[PDB]
Amino acid sequence: MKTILSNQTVDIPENVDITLKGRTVIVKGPRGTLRRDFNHINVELSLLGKKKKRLRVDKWWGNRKELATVRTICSHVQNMIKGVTLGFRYKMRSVYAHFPINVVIQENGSLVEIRNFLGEKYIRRVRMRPGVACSVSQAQKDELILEGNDIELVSNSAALIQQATTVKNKDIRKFLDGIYVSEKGTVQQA
Amino acid sequence: KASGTLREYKVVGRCLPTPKCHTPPLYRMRIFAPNHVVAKSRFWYFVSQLKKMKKSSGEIVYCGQVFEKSPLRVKNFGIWLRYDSRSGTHNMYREYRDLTTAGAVTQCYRDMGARHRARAHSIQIMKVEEIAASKCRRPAVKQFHDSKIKFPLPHRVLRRQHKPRFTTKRPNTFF
Amino acid sequence: VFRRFVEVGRVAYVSFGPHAGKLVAIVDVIDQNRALVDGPCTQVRRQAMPFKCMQLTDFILKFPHSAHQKYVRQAWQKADINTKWAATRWAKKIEARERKAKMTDFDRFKVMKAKKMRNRIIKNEVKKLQKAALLKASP
Amino acid sequence: EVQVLVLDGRGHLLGRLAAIVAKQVLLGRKVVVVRCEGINISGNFYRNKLKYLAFLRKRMNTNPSRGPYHFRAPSRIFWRTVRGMLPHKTKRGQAALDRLKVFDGIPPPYDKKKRMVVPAALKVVRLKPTRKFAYLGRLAHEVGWKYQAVTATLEEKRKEKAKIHYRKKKQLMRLRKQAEKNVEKKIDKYTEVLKTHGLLV
Amino acid sequence: SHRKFSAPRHGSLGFLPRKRSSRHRGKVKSFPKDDPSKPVHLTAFLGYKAGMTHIVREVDRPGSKVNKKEVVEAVTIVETPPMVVVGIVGYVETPRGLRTFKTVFAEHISDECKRRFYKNWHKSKKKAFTKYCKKWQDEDGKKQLEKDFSSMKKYCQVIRVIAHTQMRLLPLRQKKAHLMEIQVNGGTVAEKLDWARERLEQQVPVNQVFGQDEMIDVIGVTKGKGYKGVTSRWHTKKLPRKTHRGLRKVAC
Amino acid sequence: SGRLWSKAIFAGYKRGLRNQREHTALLKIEGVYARDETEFYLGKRCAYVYKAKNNTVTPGGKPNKTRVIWGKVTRAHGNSGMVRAKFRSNLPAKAIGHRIRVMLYPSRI
RNA sequence: GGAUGAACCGAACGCCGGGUUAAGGCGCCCGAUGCCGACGCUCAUCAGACCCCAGAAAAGGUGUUGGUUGAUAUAGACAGCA
RNA sequence: CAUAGCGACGUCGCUUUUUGAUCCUUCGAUGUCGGCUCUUCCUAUCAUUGUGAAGCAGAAUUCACCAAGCGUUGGAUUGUU
RNA sequence: AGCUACCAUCUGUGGGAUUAUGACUGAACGCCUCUAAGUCAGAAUCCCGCCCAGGCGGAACGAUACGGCAGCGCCGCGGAGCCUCGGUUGGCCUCGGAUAGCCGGUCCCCCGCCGGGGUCCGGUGCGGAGUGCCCUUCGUCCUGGGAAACGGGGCGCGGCCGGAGAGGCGGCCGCCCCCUCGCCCGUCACGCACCGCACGUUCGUGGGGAACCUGGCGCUAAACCAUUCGUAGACGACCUGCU
Ligand SMILES: [Mg+2]
Ligand SMILES: [Mg+2]
Ligand SMILES: [Mg+2]
Ligand SMILES: [Mg+2]
Ligand SMILES: [Mg+2]
Ligand SMILES: [Mg+2]
Ligand SMILES: [Mg+2]
Ligand SMILES: [Mg+2]
Ligand SMILES: [Mg+2]
Ligand SMILES: [Mg+2]
Ligand SMILES: [Mg+2]
Ligand SMILES: [Mg+2]
Ligand SMILES: [Mg+2]
Ligand SMILES: [Mg+2]
Ligand SMILES: [Mg+2]
Ligand SMILES: [Mg+2]
DSSP states of C65-103? TT--HHHHHHHHHTTTHHHHHHHSHHHHHHHHHHHHHT-
Is residue D128 less than 8 Å (CB to CB) from chain A?
no
Q: What are phi and psi of D22, to 5 degrees?
A: -65, -45
Contacts for D92 with CB less than 8 Å, ≥ 6 apart: D26, F96, F97
F66 contact to strand G (CB, 7 A limit): no
d(CA E163, CA E80): 13
Read off the DSSP letter of residue C16. Answer: S
Among the partner residues D183, D193, D199, nearest to C121 by beta-carbon distance: D183
Q: Which chain A residue's Cα is nearest to B140? A: A1
Closest CA to B144 of B78, B93, B97: B97
Which candidate, E43, E39, E19, E42, places its Cα nearest to that of E29?
Answer: E43
Size of interface A-C (CB pairs under 8 A): 8
- The experimental resolution of this structure, in angstroms, equals 2.5
Query: Does the beta-carbon distance from B154 to A60 stay under 8 Å?
Result: yes
CA–CA gap between residue F85 and residue F28 (Å, rounded): 10
Coil vs helix vs strand at D74: helix
Cβ-defined contact of D28 to F30 (cutoff 8 Å):
no
How far is residue C124's CA from residue E127's CA, in Å, rounded to a whole number? Answer: 60
Is F84's Cβ below 8 Å from some Cβ in D? Answer: no
Q: Which nucleotide is nearest to B163 (CA to C1')?
A: G34
Compute the nearest-CA separation of F32 from chain B (Å). 11
Chain A hits for B152, Cβ within 8 Å = 60
Supply the DSSP symbol for A40. Answer: T
What's the per-residue H, E or C state across A99-115?
Answer: CCCCEEECHHHCEEEEC
- Could you give the CA distance from residue D44 to residue D29 in angstroms, rounded to a whole number? 33
The alpha-carbon gap from D120 to the nearest alpha carbon of chain B, in Å, equals 5
Phi and psi, residue F79, nearest 5°: -115, 0
Closest Cα partner for D20 from A103, B164, E16? Answer: B164
Q: Which residues of F touch B163 (CB under 8 A)?
A: 33
Closest nucleotide to D57's CA, by C1' atom?
A: I46
What span, in angstroms and rounded, lies between the C-alpha atoms of D153 and E95? 10
Comparing alpha-carbon positions, the chain D residue that sits nearest to B156 is D125
Q: Report how far residue D157's alpha carbon sits from residue D106's, in angstroms, rounded to the nearest whole number.
A: 11
Which residues does B contribute to its contact with A (CB < 8 Å)?
A: 139-140, 143-144, 149, 151-152, 154-155
Contact F97 D27 (CB under 8 A): yes
The H or E element spanning position D127 is: none
10 Å CB burial of residue B16 (0-12, 13-18, 19+) is exposed
Which residues in D lie closer than 8 A to residue A66 (C-beta atoms)? 130
Chain G positions within 7 A of any protein Cβ atom are 1-2, 4, 17-19, 27-41, 43-45, 47, 64-68
Residue of D nearest to B154 (CA): D129
Cβ pair C30:B74 closer than 8 A = yes
Please say whether the beta carbons of A55 and A44 come within 8 A: no
For residue E122, give the nearest of E175, E180, E178 by alpha carbon.
E175
d(CA B18, CA B32) in angstroms, rounded, equals 31
In angstroms, the CA B122 to CA B116 distance is 11
Does a cis peptide bond (omega within 30 degrees of 0) precede residue F106?
Answer: no
Query: CA–C1' span, D72 to H45, in Å?
Result: 34
Is the minimum CB–CB distance between F30 and chain D shorter than 8 Å?
yes
Q: What are phi and psi of D35, to 5 degrees?
A: 55, 55
Spacing, Cα D156 to ligand 6 middle (Å) = 61
Which one-letter DSSP state was computed for residue F40? Answer: G
The DSSP annotation for E36-58 comes to: TTSPPEE-----EEEEEEEEEEE
Handedness of CA A46, A49, A50, A52 (dihedral sign): negative
Q: Mark yes or no for CB contact C103/D198 under 8 Å.
A: yes
Report the neighbours of A using a cutoff of 3 or more CB pairs below 8 angstroms. B, C, D
Instruction: Give the whole-angstrom CA distance, residue E170 versus residue E166.
Output: 7
d(CA B117, CA B114): 6
**Of C31, C33, C32, C37, the residue nearest C12 (C-alpha):** C37
A151-159, long-range: CB within 8 Å, 24+ apart, which pairs? A151/A79, A151/A82, A151/A83, A151/A88, A153/A129, A154/A88, A154/A89, A154/A90, A154/A129, A155/A88, A155/A90, A155/A181, A155/A184, A156/A129, A157/A90, A157/A126, A157/A128, A157/A129, A157/A132, A158/A90, A158/A92
Q: Report the distance separating Cα F24 and Cα F87, nearest Å.
A: 7
Q: Which nucleotide is nearest to A174 (CA to C1')?
A: H57
> Closest residue by Cα to the C1' atom of nucleotide I167?
D108
Q: For strand H, is any atom closer than 7 Å to the CB of E7? A: yes
Between CA A146 and C1' H51 the distance (Å) reads 29
Q: Is F106 left (phi over 0), alpha (psi -120 to 50) or beta?
A: beta
Residues of B in contact with F33 (CB under 8 A): 162-163, 165
Phi and psi at residue B167, to the nearest 5°: -155, 165
CA dist., res. E209 & res. E189, Å (int)? 19
- Nearest alpha carbon to residue E26 among E235, E163, E180, E150: E180
- Please tell me the total number of residues recorded for chain F in this structure: 109
**DSSP letters spanning E179-225:** EEEEEEESS-HHHHHHHHHHHTT-EE-HHHH--TT------------
Q: C54 near C13, Cβ under 8 Å?
A: yes
In terms of Cα–Cα distance, which of D125, A151, E182, D64 is closest to B174? D125
Beta bridge partners of B65: B9
Question: Distance from residue A178 (CA) to nucleotide I156 (C1'), in Å?
Answer: 89
Residue ranges of E strands in E117-202: 158-164, 179-185
Count of B-F CB contacts under 8 Å: 3
Chain C residue with minimum CA distance to B150:
C7
Query: Cβ C36–B74 below 8 Å, yes or no?
Result: yes
Cβ(B61)–Cβ(B26) under 8 Å? yes
Structure determined by? cryo-EM
| Displacement of CA E141 from its chain's centroid (Å) | 32
* Closest chain C C-alpha to D67 CA, distance in angstroms: 50
Strand, coil or helix: D61: coil
State which residue of chain D sits closest to C105, comparing Cα positions.
D197
CB contact under 8 A, C111 and D194: yes
Question: Could you check: is the Cβ of residue D3 within 7 Å of any atom of nucleic acid strand I?
Answer: yes
Distance of alpha carbon C114 from alpha carbon D195, whole angstroms: 11
Report which secondary-structure segment, H or E, holds D177. Answer: helix D148-182
| Residue C87, burial from CB neighbour count under 10 angstroms (0-12, 13-18, 19+) | exposed
Are E189 and E41 in contact by the 8 Å Cβ rule? The answer is no
**Which nucleotides of strand H lie under 7 Å from a protein CB?**
17, 35-41, 51-54, 56-59, 70-74
Q: How distant, in Å, are the alpha carbons of D36, E138, F20, F42, F72 from that of F90?
A: 41, 69, 12, 19, 12
One-letter identity of residue B140:
A
For chain D, say whether F95 makes contact (Cβ under 8 Å): no
Which chain B residue is nearest to residue F34, measuring alpha carbons?
B163
Q: Are A136 and A112 in contact (CB under 8 A)?
A: no
Evaluated on CA atoms C128, C129, C132, C134, the torsion sign reads: negative
Question: Closest partner residue to E93 among D104, D105, D150, by Cβ?
Answer: D150
Q: Chain-centre distance of CA B17, in angstroms?
A: 34
Residues E97 and E145: their CA atoms lie apart, in Å, by 26
| Beta-carbon separation of A46 and C1 below 8 A | yes
The bridge status of strand E41-42 relative to strand D100-102 is: unpaired
Residue F45 near residue F106 (C-beta atoms within 8 A): yes
The kind and range of the H/E element at D52 are: helix D45-57
